[PDB]
Amino acid sequence: DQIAELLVESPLFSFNCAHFIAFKGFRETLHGHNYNVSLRLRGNIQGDGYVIDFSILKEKVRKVCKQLDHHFILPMYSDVLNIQEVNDNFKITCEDNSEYSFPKRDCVQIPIKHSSTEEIGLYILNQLIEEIDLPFLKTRSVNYMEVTVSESPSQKATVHRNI
Amino acid sequence: DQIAELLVESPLFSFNCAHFIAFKGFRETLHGHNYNVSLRLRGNIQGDGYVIDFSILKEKVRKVCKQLDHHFILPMYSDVLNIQEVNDNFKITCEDNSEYSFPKRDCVQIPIKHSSTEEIGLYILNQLIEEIDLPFLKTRSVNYMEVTVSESPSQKATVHRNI
Amino acid sequence: DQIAELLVESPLFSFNCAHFIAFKGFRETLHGHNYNVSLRLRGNIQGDGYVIDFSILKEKVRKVCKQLDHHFILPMYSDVLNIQEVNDNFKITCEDNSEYSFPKRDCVQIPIKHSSTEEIGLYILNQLIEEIDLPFLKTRSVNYMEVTVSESPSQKATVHRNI
Amino acid sequence: DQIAELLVESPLFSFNCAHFIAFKGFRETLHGHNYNVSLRLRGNIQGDGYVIDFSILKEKVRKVCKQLDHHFILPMYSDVLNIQEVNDNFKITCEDNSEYSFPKRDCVQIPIKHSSTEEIGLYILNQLIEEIDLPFLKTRSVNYMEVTVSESPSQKATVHRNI
Amino acid sequence: DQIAELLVESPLFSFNCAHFIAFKGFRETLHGHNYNVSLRLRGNIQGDGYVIDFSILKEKVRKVCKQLDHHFILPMYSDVLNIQEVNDNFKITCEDNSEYSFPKRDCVQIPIKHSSTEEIGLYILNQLIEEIDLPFLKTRSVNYMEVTVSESPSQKATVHRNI
Amino acid sequence: DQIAELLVESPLFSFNCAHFIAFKGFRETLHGHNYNVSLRLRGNIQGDGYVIDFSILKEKVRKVCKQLDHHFILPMYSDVLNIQEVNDNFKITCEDNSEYSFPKRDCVQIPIKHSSTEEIGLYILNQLIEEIDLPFLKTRSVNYMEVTVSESPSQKATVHRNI
Numbered sequence: 001d002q003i004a005e006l007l008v009e010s011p012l013f014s015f016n017c018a019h020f021i022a023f024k025g026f027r028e029t030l031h032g033h034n035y036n037v038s039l040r041l042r043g044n045i046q047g048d049g050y051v052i053d054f055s056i057l058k059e060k061v062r063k064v065c066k067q068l069d070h071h072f073i074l075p076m077y078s079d080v081l082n083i084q085e086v087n088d089n090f091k092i093t094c095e096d097n098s099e100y101s102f103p104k105r106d107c108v109q110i111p112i113k114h115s116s117t118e119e120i121g122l123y124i125l126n127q128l129i130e131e132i133d134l135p136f137l138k139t140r141s142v143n144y145m146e147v148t149v150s151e152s153p154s155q156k157a158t159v160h161r162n163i
Numbered sequence: 164d165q166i167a168e169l170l171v172e173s174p175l176f177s178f179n180c181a182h183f184i185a186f187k188g189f190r191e192t193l194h195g196h197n198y199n200v201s202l203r204l205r206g207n208i209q210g211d212g213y214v215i216d217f218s219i220l221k222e223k224v225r226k227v228c229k230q231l232d233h234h235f236i237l238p239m240y241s242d243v244l245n246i247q248e249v250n251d252n253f254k255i256t257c258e259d260n261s262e263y264s265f266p267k268r269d270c271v272q273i274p275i276k277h278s279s280t281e282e283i284g285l286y287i288l289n290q291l292i293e294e295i296d297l298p299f300l301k302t303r304s305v306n307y308m309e310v311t312v313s314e315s316p317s318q319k320a321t322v323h324r325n326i
Numbered sequence: 327d328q329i330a331e332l333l334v335e336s337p338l339f340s341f342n343c344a345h346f347i348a349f350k351g352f353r354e355t356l357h358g359h360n361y362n363v364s365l366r367l368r369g370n371i372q373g374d375g376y377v378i379d380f381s382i383l384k385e386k387v388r389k390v391c392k393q394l395d396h397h398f399i400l401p402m403y404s405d406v407l408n409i410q411e412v413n414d415n416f417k418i419t420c421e422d423n424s425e426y427s428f429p430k431r432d433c434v435q436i437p438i439k440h441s442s443t444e445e446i447g448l449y450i451l452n453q454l455i456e457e458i459d460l461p462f463l464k465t466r467s468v469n470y471m472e473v474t475v476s477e478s479p480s481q482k483a484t485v486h487r488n489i
Numbered sequence: 490d491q492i493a494e495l496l497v498e499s500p501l502f503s504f505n506c507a508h509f510i511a512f513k514g515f516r517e518t519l520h521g522h523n524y525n526v527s528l529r530l531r532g533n534i535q536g537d538g539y540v541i542d543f544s545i546l547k548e549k550v551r552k553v554c555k556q557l558d559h560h561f562i563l564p565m566y567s568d569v570l571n572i573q574e575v576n577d578n579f580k581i582t583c584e585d586n587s588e589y590s591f592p593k594r595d596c597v598q599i600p601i602k603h604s605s606t607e608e609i610g611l612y613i614l615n616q617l618i619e620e621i622d623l624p625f626l627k628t629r630s631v632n633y634m635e636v637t638v639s640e641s642p643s644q645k646a647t648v649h650r651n652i
Numbered sequence: 653d654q655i656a657e658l659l660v661e662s663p664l665f666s667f668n669c670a671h672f673i674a675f676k677g678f679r680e681t682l683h684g685h686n687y688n689v690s691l692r693l694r695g696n697i698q699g700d701g702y703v704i705d706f707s708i709l710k711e712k713v714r715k716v717c718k719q720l721d722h723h724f725i726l727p728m729y730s731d732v733l734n735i736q737e738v739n740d741n742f743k744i745t746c747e748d749n750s751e752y753s754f755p756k757r758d759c760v761q762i763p764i765k766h767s768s769t770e771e772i773g774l775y776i777l778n779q780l781i782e783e784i785d786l787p788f789l790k791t792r793s794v795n796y797m798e799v800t801v802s803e804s805p806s807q808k809a810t811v812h813r814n815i
Numbered sequence: 816d817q818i819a820e821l822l823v824e825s826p827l828f829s830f831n832c833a834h835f836i837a838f839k840g841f842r843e844t845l846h847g848h849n850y851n852v853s854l855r856l857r858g859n860i861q862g863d864g865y866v867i868d869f870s871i872l873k874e875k876v877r878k879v880c881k882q883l884d885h886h887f888i889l890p891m892y893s894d895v896l897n898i899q900e901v902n903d904n905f906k907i908t909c910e911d912n913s914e915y916s917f918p919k920r921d922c923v924q925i926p927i928k929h930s931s932t933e934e935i936g937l938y939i940l941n942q943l944i945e946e947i948d949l950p951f952l953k954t955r956s957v958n959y960m961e962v963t964v965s966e967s968p969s970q971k972a973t974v975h976r977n978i
């Protein structure tokens with residue numbers, strides 16, 4: 001069997017979001033990014049000529065990005081943010097006592113500690129594997145999944161999982 | 164005299180910002196972009212071989228972008244936003260009664276009606292001409308200034324002024 | 327009123343097609359390209375902050391490209407091609423007596439003389455104006471439409487219409 | 490000895506071709522792509538300062554691409570295509586009884602089962618190693634060869650060989 | 653007749669050169685650039701489907717770039733450089749009394765005052781028109797020629813001629 | 816602990832330099848390039864959400880590039896170049912008896928044998944590790960450093976060190 005690595009990258013695999021980094025002793029001002037996701041896979045070329053169909057890969061990456069797109073990225077497990085539910089809003093109080101308030105529908109609650117490129121990358125990798133389906137990947141002989149998330153065309157973070 | 168057109172474009176000429184479009188009957192959720200600015204000018208090639216030194220152009224575009232960078236873009240002259248000053252915060256109330264609250268230092272107050280690519284473009288064009296200095300441009304025989312602002316690698320707006 | 331130029335460009339605005347150039351005294355072999363379309367327009371910034379919404383522009387360009395995508399581009403008005411209908415196929419006979427046969431559903435019949443980048447550009451410009459709707463463009467104060475079609479990242483053709 | 494990885498990538502390393510994917514239970518319509526090839530090598534930096542001269546790498550990749558360029562990619566070992574020689578043409582009959590006919594000179598017969606990016610990649614890798622010459626690579630201490638073939642700027646396949 | 657604008661741009665249209673800017677009161681240190689040339693032309697679409705064949709445009713731009721490629725760019729008409737012929741070398745003495753010496757074959761003597769992007773652009777425009785041939789351009793109904801030279805991906809100069 | 820790979824790449828991480836390759840039996844003419852450096856790191860995501868802050872990486876790469884920028888790259892340990900100190904100049908005599916002379920301030924003396932992309936890459940990797948500081952990288956759990964240097968957008972060399 002011949003091993004091949006597949007890469008799917010497009011300006012279409014994007015989520016335009018607001019966020020700010022906060023950790024112990026540090027907080028930055030509210031801003032945003034055009035985030036971009038590329039997916040890399042390793043496996044054997046199957047009897048149909050594909051390792052796995054690009055169209056399937058393109059479809060699932062678009063779906064994960066869409067869920068994030070056009071929202072403030074709110075880290076659920078942050079140890080430095082006080083996240084309060086006030087009416088139909090999320091109220092965020094920081095260590096330096098600075099206060100934010102956004103409508104809940106404007107926010108996407110993500111099970112992460114920091115809205116860093118590294119942690120958003122891990123979240124997307126976990127979501128993509130469930131979206132494409134793990135046993136479906138194994139039927140296509142895929143044994144390696146890798147996502148690259150860019151905060152900007154200059155700053156990229158890459159995470160992987162051996163499956 | 165020989166006419167030449169100069170273009171300065173770089174991922175460095177960027178401002179990573181949060182915003183949302185609001186006008187009559189329409190409001191979108193809070194998100195963000197990696198905005199990018201390119202500058203185009205027309206003039207005669209001077210006795211020093213330049214129309215105008217690229218280093219000067221690169222310096223001033225960076226300065227204008229820096230002022231916007233890492234902030235929520237707040238349109239001062241919006242007819243559909245209620246902008247209240249509450250302590251050290253800006254409180255924004257929309258037509259649909261949705262409420263936002265950001266620290267003042269997280270916001271950049273821009274004399275525009277909408278945080279659209281078109282209007283941000285006009286603002287930057289006006290700021291760049293004052294930053295480079297109008298009579299300084301005329302000594303270099305520059306008679307045309309043009310800025311292109313991109314909200315994303317896919318969406319661009321271009322404005323100009325004949326000087 | 328402030329004049330602004332809008333540009334929409336994406337690898338998404340693509341049609342992957344087969345074709346060959348044929349004119350008097352010249353014929354090339356069957357091949358293909360990843361064609362790409364960018365749209366440029368000029369108008370005044372309206373009271374909503376837009377010249378025209380990017381989402382509308384992105385939607386219509388995708389629709390025009392989709393109609394062409396994944397087909398052999400067949401020039402209807404070619405003076406050097408003999409196009410015969412044989413069962414459910416198009417049979418193409420060239421000046422040098424070379425013969426092609428494709429299923430009809432594999433072909434897209436385009437009202438052009440040559441499948442050149444220039445002529446495909448004109449066709450798309452005409453189709454896009456009808457797709458976006460001419461009187462709709464005039465309500466947005468758009469007076470200039472321009473399409474750029476690339477045969478390759480290296481070879482581009484640009485056509486326009488004053489509206 | 491210091492290990493270095495060399496990459497050669499250019500829009501020049503291209504073959505503009507027609508093709509369609511066909512396997513068991515699936516057939517797509519005739520279309521085309523601007524295919525692009527990049528080559529990656531690993532080895533030790535030699536006494537002349539190079540692992541291997543870029544000019545040699547650039548020359549051989551161009552030669553392999555040229556052989557494919559401007560043709561319909563015809564898979565020789567397809568289990569779902571009936572390839573008939575009719576006069577100076579190749580007649581291709583599919584499982585769904587759809588019929589194609591191209592002049593032989595318009596086709597490039599490649600020892601593959603499917604004209605997929607994965608299989609075209611493997612073919613090019615095999616051809617490039619023979620073109621650069623295997624024992625010539627070993628004299629330059631090259632122990633790893635890797636080709637990346639893109640069907641589009643969005644879809645890439647990568648294969649390698651340890652030498 | 654339908655007007656179309658043709659653009660040819662490639663990393664292939666390059667000349668990798670050494671140079672330094674010198675004018676009255678200013679001199680910079682010796683360095684180099686990967687210069688890149690793109691050509692833009694306007695004309696009517698001819699009866700063969702082309703305004704002008706891209707292959708002809710690609711061939712002539714490559715020829716002009718090749719003449720410059722791999723040399724020190726020496727401005728012949730500089731008012732601040734003392735250019736002496738010493739044996740098989742060019743000896744260059746600057747205003748600040750700094751001395752350079754290169755073999756003559758390493759230098760390309762260009763009829764310009766400064767090795768600026770603007771002036772190199774003008775030279776290439778003049779050379780390209782003569783290389784493609786002026787009356788040949790008029791037979792193809794070309795009435796506009798435009799070259800863009802980039803010193804870097806960030807700094808570009810564009811010049812034109814109405815023909 | 817979760818392993819993440821960080822990539823920092825920008826047209827800003829550049830050094831525009833003059834050079835020529837010389838080794839046994841071969842010498843090329845003086846020319847130049849827009850060199851570009853990208854940095855790749857592997858480590859665990861720390862309690863602050865970062866493997867290592869991008870801003871620190873961006874700052875140090877800029878500093879190393881700046882030291883090289885706007886100079887002739889002079890290889891100190893070349894076995895085929897006779898490097899003489901004449902007044903305030905470096906005089907370079909080659910095997911074929913060709914002579915160069917540059918002011919010392921125009922040259923950057925680099926502890927390498929050839930000004931190849933491979934060897935410049937190794938030098939930068941060594942300089943970057945000392946600039947970021949080795950024990951500082953170990954506190955951030957970084958165990959892999961990798962630099963990619965491009966002579967042109969087409970030609971790249973990549974070197975690494977396991978730390």
Ligand SMILES: C[C@@H](O)[C@@H](O)c1cnc2nc(N)[nH]c(=O)c2n1
Binds near residue numbers: 116151865870
């Ligand atoms: C400056 C802005 O990009 C900020 O959000 C920032 C700064 N440094 C960073 N550093 C890393 N490693 N990851 C990030 O997401 C990151 N993010």
Ligand SMILES: C[C@@H](O)[C@@H](O)c1cnc2nc(N)[nH]c(=O)c2n1
Binds near residue numbers: 673680767768769770
């Ligand atoms: C610094 C110098 O070598 C180079 O970067 C530079 C700077 N400014 C410039 N400015 C103009 N107008 N043209 C140039 O070629 C130019 N070139």
Ligand SMILES: C[C@@H](O)[C@@H](O)c1cnc2nc(N)[nH]c(=O)c2n1
Binds near residue numbers: 281332377378380381
């Ligand atoms: C959806 C919105 O946030 C953004 O994608 C968008 C959409 N359409 C737009 N349309 C115009 N004209 N200008 C914009 O800035 C713009 N911006």
Ligand SMILES: C[C@@H](O)[C@@H](O)c1cnc2nc(N)[nH]c(=O)c2n1
Binds near residue numbers: 006050051604644
């Ligand atoms: C849609 C078009 O690209 C089609 O030819 C296609 C679809 N899916 C694919 N999927 C893979 N993995 N490789 C291909 O070459 C490929 N090719």
Ligand SMILES: C[C@@H](O)[C@@H](O)c1cnc2nc(N)[nH]c(=O)c2n1
Binds near residue numbers: 442
């Ligand atoms: C060779 C041919 O298939 C293609 O590369 C080509 C070459 N020259 C061209 N020239 C023009 N003007 N338009 C084209 O579409 C064109 N297209």
Ligand SMILES: C[C@@H](O)[C@@H](O)c1cnc2nc(N)[nH]c(=O)c2n1
Binds near residue numbers: 495539543
């Ligand atoms: C042609 C020009 O790039 C020349 O300096 C050159 C040629 N071949 C090369 N080959 C390698 N491997 N590395 C180089 O830096 C290199 N450099």
Ligand SMILES: [Zn+2]
Binds near residue numbers: 019021031033
């Ligand atoms: Zn950020």
Ligand SMILES: [Zn+2]
Binds near residue numbers: 183184194195196314
């Ligand atoms: Zn937006």
Ligand SMILES: [Zn+2]
Binds near residue numbers: 346347357477
């Ligand atoms: Zn073609």
Ligand SMILES: [Zn+2]
Binds near residue numbers: 508510520
């Ligand atoms: Zn395809």
Ligand SMILES: [Zn+2]
Binds near residue numbers: 673684
């Ligand atoms: Zn320079």
Ligand SMILES: [Zn+2]
Binds near residue numbers: 847
């Ligand atoms: Zn070189």
